[PDB]
Amino acid sequence: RPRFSFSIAAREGKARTGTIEMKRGVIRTPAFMPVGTAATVKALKPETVRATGADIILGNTYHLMLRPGAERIAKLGGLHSFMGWDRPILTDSGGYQVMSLSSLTKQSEEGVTFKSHLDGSRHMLSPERSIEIQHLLGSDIVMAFDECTPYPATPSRAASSMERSMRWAKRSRDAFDSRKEQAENAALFGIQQGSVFENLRQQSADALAEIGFDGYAVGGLAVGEGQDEMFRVLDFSVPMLPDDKPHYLMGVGKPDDIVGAVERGIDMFDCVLPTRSGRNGQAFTWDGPINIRNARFSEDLKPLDSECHCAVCQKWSRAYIHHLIRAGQILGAMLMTEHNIAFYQQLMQKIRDSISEGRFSQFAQDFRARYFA
C-alpha cells in the first residue's frame, strides 16, 4: 500500500464514500474511529475492536505522554506493538486535553507548559514536541498542534487563536517533514479553526490549503454550540476545505450528529462514550438510546437492539446487562462498550452503502424518523 491515498468511490450531494489506503491498512469512509485512552480502547481487546468493524482507532496523546511516556513506548516498539493493534492509528495532538485536564497551564507563542493532573510533574507541548511525541508513538495519522477556541468566542479572540493555529500548522508541517521516517510513512492532517465566523473559517481553510496537508479537520465544534449551530457552521465550512482530501469532524459524536455531518461532507469521526451520572448504562438502538439501568429492563429478555448483529446482542439479554451494570461488574462495561462500538460501525456501514447506492438522503430521513420516534 502507499503512504496515503484517499479515493472517492461514490457521491450524493455533499456526501462521499471511499477509502483511505495507508501502509497499515485500508480505512473505509465515512469512518468511525473508536477512541483509545492510555493505550486501550476501554474494556475491549484490540481483536474485539476489529471485530466490531473498526478500520482505525484514535490514540489520545495527552495521557500517553504522561503514562507510560512517549519515549518509553518508542523504546518498547511503538504504540501498535505495545497495545496489540496493528492497523492504522490516528493520534490527536495532546493540545485539547492539556486545556481540559491539566492545571497551571501557561500558554505562549512557543506552545504550552502545564502540570500533570495525575501528578505534580511539569510538562511542555509545542507544535514541534507534539509532532515528535506522535512520531515516538508511531502514529499513522498525525494531527497538527493547534490552539483551541472556547465557545462562545468574540470575533477578536477567535481570530487571534485561528491565526496562532495557522502559524502552528506551518510549524507542525515543517516538524513532520524534517523527520524522514515520519514523512515517508505517516500522514499529517491540518485543523481548520475560526469559531462560528465564516470569514475566519475561510482564511483558515485558505492558510491550511496553502501549507498543504493530507487531510483537513474541522476543529472547534461540539464545544457547546448545539446541533443547529454546528450544522450551520459545517454548511459553509466544509466546502472551503480541499474536496479531494478527507474531512474530519473531531470529537463528534451522537449518531444523529454523524448522519447530519456526513450530509455536509464529513468523512471521519471519533468520540468517547459517556459514563457520568449512570450514562455508562446508555446503549444505542435504532429506536434511539436507552439506559439499561432503568428498572423497566430488569426482566427484559430481548437483546439491546433487535437488529444489531453484534456478539453481545447474539448472546445476552437486556436483563443480564441491566444486572451487570447495576452491580458495577466489569463484564457490564465490556458488553456495553462492544455493543455501542458495533452499533456505530453498523451505522457507518449503512451510511457507506446508502451513499454507494445513491440513497443516502432517503437513509438519513428513515434513520431520523425511527431514531426519534
Place this chain on the structure above:
Amino acid sequence: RPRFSFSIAAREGKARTGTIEMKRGVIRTPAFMPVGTAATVKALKPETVRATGADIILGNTYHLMLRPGAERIAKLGGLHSFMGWDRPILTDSGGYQVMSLSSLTKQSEEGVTFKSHLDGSRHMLSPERSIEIQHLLGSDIVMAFDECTPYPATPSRAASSMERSMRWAKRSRDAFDSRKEQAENAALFGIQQGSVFENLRQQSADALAEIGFDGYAVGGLAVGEGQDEMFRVLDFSVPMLPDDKPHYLMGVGKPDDIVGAVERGIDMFDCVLPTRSGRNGQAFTWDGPINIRNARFSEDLKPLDSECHCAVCQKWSRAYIHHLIRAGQILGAMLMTEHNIAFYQQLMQKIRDSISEGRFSQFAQDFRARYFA
C-alpha cells in the same frame, strides 16, 4: 450423560484423577472451578472462561439471592441461560457469605436471618431455603447448608457447630430429594465439619456417609490456620470420607495449597483471586507469583510467564499489563484474570497428566523446587 457419575481413571498414593459426568458436561478431576460472583466470572466472558480450560464454574448464592434475586433468575430461565454458561455450575449454600458479609445476623436451629450488606433488606436462609434457591438458580451441584466454625474454635463449640451442620445436612438432603426435577437432574454434596479435631471430623464423616451424598467437601479449612495445620487436618480427614465420591476443598487456594491437597486426596478446588492492596496486580508464574505493578516490569517485554500457553501471554507484554494495571484500566483486569485462570487450568492439567502417568509425586517436588526457588 447420567445425572452424576464419578469415575477414577488413575491413582498415585492418595491422589486420584478421573471424571465427573453430568448432564451438562464432563468435569476432569482434579478440577479448579473459577468463581462467578453475581452471575459473572470477573472481567471474563463465559467463552473466555471455557477457553482457559474450565469445565465447571462456581456460583456464589449469597450475592445472587440479593441481586438480581433467585426467583427473578428462575423466571428468566435459570443461571446458565442468564449468564451464558451452558456447562456445569456448582453453587455454594450462601451460608458462608452471610456470616462474612451481612449484618444483624441472628442464628438459630432453623437457620439464619440477616440484613443485606448492599441494602437494608431483611432475608432468611435455612437448609430448606438454601436448597430452594439453588434449585431456582438451576445449579448442577448443590451444596448442603451448614454452620461454619470460626478458627480457633474450642472443642465444645466445634462439636456444637458440627452437630448442627449434620442435622442441617439431613435437612438439606430431604429438601433436595423432595423436589423431583432437582433430585433427577442435579447432584448434592455434603460438608464435613469438626475444626481441627480428629474425633469430630470422624463423627462428621460418619454422619454424612450415613445420610449419603454425591460428593463430600472438607469444610472449615483455610480460615486462618496456616498451611501446615491445614495439611495436618487433611492428612486424617480426607481418608474418612467415602473413597468412591469426589472430595472438595472449599475456597482453596494458592497453587502450592492445591498441589499439597491433591497429594492428600482432594479432587475439586475453587478460589477467588486477591485484589486488595495492589493484589489485583498479582500474576502466577511457574517461578512463583509476581506483582506486575512493580516498577521492575515497566519495560519488561516478556509475557507474564515464559511457558504459559494462554492468549494473554501469546499477545501482550509485562510492560503493557504493568501500564494497564497502574492506570486502573479495565483491560488490565481482563488480561490479568484470563492469565491467572489459565495458569490454574494448566496447573490442574499438569496434575491430571502426572497422576495418569504415575509421576505426580515427582511433579509435586519439581513444581515446589521451581515455584519457591
